[PDB]
């Protein structure tokens, strides 16, 4: 049985004050033993958040680069993330891919380098609306997963996050069934392309819109192992999502 | 005015808390002249760390930022966060952003306007690549880049322009002091006839090419060179020699 995993992606939000208040809320929250909880603060606050957060919650960088040190003004390395006490990095997030044009190859190289450096990786995939309506959900999502997998030697430190990008701001929504259909298919790719052990043990988490109201039906899906939470991660309702399985 | 000499240390993607803490200790003990303005740009995960450890005489800069105050931009930081961390500058348009990460002029323009509107100072970088230089179009590239920045500047008192001779990195070429001067003087001439005389006379244009212990002096003596954006030397004791380049 895969351990339930709840990540809170704060994206580019917050200052020390309101994030300190958020953290104070999380510290007082009772996080179940069976649930693994991770918060991804803005890059300027990885160090701050790690100092202020209770050890029971892990800290993630929102991105990193693919080399340990170098001439890359504006980037950070897994070494720096580790040095700040964070144990995870989010890679391949839809905003990196689709606003900042990060290629599959780049994401793959980043994954291999973060893993070689002792970090865990939350590796994001997902298809856009035009890809969904064209019938190529599987093609896009399998090709993205392949390039990640090509760069993974030890899946015990990886978590796959499915983002239904086709549902973000488009006027379409994903049902719990539709999330399940994709998750199950992703697991089926891990089976047909990597191994059965890896399909069985790898957390595939849902990165679509998740609220206090919908998190329960979503969490009940056989192949949904948790969430990568967007906007709700900045709010008390993140604690409701930490408690989703019941 | 005259223009206050300006020395920025760009640490790029280098260091951890230990060796950067030791570097900072070196800088804190250094005597920085009153007539020199010194700024250090740490990796983004260490803006807050460096500001806490660095003496107030040295300012802190982010190496990049985004163009909006908060938002759905996983991996980015805003000028509001930079300020909140005690940093007062941001480097924008650095050649590595433009040429490795494909940041466009339009994007850099928008980032400059937003950083300025948020009360940050901006070190705005420009520079031509080798293929652009050998094609004879140094001026075209460098003037177009400066124009998009200038379009997004309402107050030049908080801006510093950095010329990076990208054409001279690793490629194998070295930029002479004269060659740097020729470009700087032309950049100032662009400001004079597209912005204003007052902005031409008062705006620091700093040199972002390779600068050592040895070569900083002739460079700093050039009429239109107002200082440096130091790359790799910024992580070393010789950055202190560059802080002292005028005398």
Decide if A42 and B77 are in contact by the 8 Å CB cutoff. Answer: yes
CA A168 to chain centre: 16
- Torsion of the alpha carbons at A111, A112, A118 and A123, rounded to the nearest 10: 20
Question: Which residue, among B200, B185, B103, has the nearest Cα to B145 in the 3D structure?
Answer: B103
| C-alpha–C-alpha distance, residues B43 and B23, integer Å | 14
Resolution attained, angstroms: 2.2
Decide if A48 and B48 are in contact by the 8 Å CB cutoff. Answer: yes
Residue linked to tokens 């990640």: A148
Neighbouring C-beta atoms of residue A140, cutoff 10 Å: 18
Decide if B94 and A74 are in contact by the 8 Å CB cutoff. Answer: yes
Per annotation, catalytic residue among B37, B94, B96, B128? B94
Write the CA distances from A170 to A94, A164, A227, B119, integer angstroms. 14, 11, 21, 35
Q: Decide if B101 contacts B75 (C-beta within 8 A).
A: no
Question: Which residue, among A140, A70, A67, A141, has the nearest Cα to A106 in the 3D structure?
Answer: A67
Domain range for B229 is 1-247
CA B7 to chain centre: 9
Neighbouring C-beta atoms of residue B228, cutoff 10 Å: 27
Per-residue tokens: A113: 């380098």
Residue linked to tokens 């920085």: B32
- Give me the number of domains chain B comprises: 1
B-chain CB neighbours of A75 within 8 Å are 13, 43-44
| C-alpha–C-alpha distance, residues A11 and A13, integer Å | 6
| C-alpha–C-alpha distance, residues B245 and B188, integer Å | 21
Q: For the CA atoms of chain B, what is the radius of gyration?
A: 17
Decide if B13 and A93 are in contact by the 8 Å CB cutoff. Answer: no
| C-alpha–C-alpha distance, residues A218 and A208, integer Å | 10
Angle B21-B63-B173 from CA coordinates, rounded to 5°: 100
| C-alpha–C-alpha distance, residues A22 and A29, integer Å | 11
Angle B126-B132-B138 from CA coordinates, rounded to 5°: 55
| C-alpha–C-alpha distance, residues B165 and B174, integer Å | 9
**Which residues 122-151 of B have a C-beta within 8 angstroms of A?**
none
Could you say which of A61, A83, A90 has the minimum Cβ distance to residue B17? A83
Q: Look at the alpha carbons of A135, A109, B92, B15 in this order and tell me if their dihedral is positive or negative.
A: positive
Neighbouring C-beta atoms of residue B218, cutoff 10 Å: 15
Measured between CA atoms, the residue of chain A closest to residue B67 is: A12
CATH number at residue B156: 3.20.20.70
Decide if B74 and A93 are in contact by the 8 Å CB cutoff. Answer: yes
Q: For the CA atoms of chain A, what is the radius of gyration?
A: 17
Measured between CA atoms, the residue of chain A closest to residue B76 is: A12
| B170 Cβ under 8 Å from any chain A Cβ | no
B-chain CB neighbours of A47 within 8 Å are 45-46, 48-49
| C-alpha–C-alpha distance, residues A236 and A229, integer Å | 12
Decide if A73 and B91 are in contact by the 8 Å CB cutoff. Answer: yes
3-state SS of B15-76?
Answer: CCHHHHHHHHHHHHHCCCCCCEEEEEECCHHHHHHHHHHCCCCCEEEECCCCCCCCECCCCC
Measured between CA atoms, the residue of chain B closest to residue A45 is: B45
Q: Decide if B65 contacts B77 (C-beta within 8 A).
A: yes
Measured between CA atoms, the residue of chain A closest to residue B84 is: A15
Could you say which of A15, A43, A67 has the minimum Cβ distance to residue B80? A15
Could you say which of A13, A44, A62 has the minimum Cβ distance to residue B82? A44
| B168 Cβ under 8 Å from any chain A Cβ | no
């Amino acid at each position: 049985s895969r351990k339930f995993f709840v990540g809170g992606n704060w994206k580019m939000n917050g200052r020390k004050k309101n994030l300190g208040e958020l953290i104070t809320t999380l510290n007082a929250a009772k996080v179940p033993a069976d649930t693994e909880v991770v918060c991804a603060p803005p890059t300027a606050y990885i160090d701050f958040a790690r100092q202020k957060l209770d050890p029971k919650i892990a800290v993630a960088a929102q991105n990193c680069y693919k080399v340990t040190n170098g001439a890359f003004t504006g980037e950070i390395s897994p070494g720096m993330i580790k040095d700040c006490g964070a144990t995870w990095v989010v890679l391949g997030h839809s905003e990196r891919r689709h606003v900042f044009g990060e290629s599959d190859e780049l994401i793959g190289q980043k994954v291999a380098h973060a893993l070689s450096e002792g970090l865990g990786v939350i590796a994001c995939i997902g298809e856009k609306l035009d890809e969904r309506e064209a019938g190529i959900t599987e093609k896009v999502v399998f090709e993205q997963t392949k390039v990640i997998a090509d760069n993974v030697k030890d899946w015990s430190k990886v978590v796959l996050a499915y983002e239904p990008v086709w549902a973000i701001g488009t006027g379409k929504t994903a049902t719990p069934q539709q999330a399940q259909e994709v998750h199950e298919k992703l697991r089926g790719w891990l089976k047909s392309n990597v191994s059965d052990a890896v399909a069985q043990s790898t957390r595939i988490i849902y990165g679509g819109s998740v609220t206090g109201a919908t998190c329960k039906e979503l969490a009940s899906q056989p192949d949904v192992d948790g969430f990568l939470v967007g906007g709700a991660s900045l709010k008390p309702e993140f604690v409701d999502i930490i408690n989703a399985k019941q």
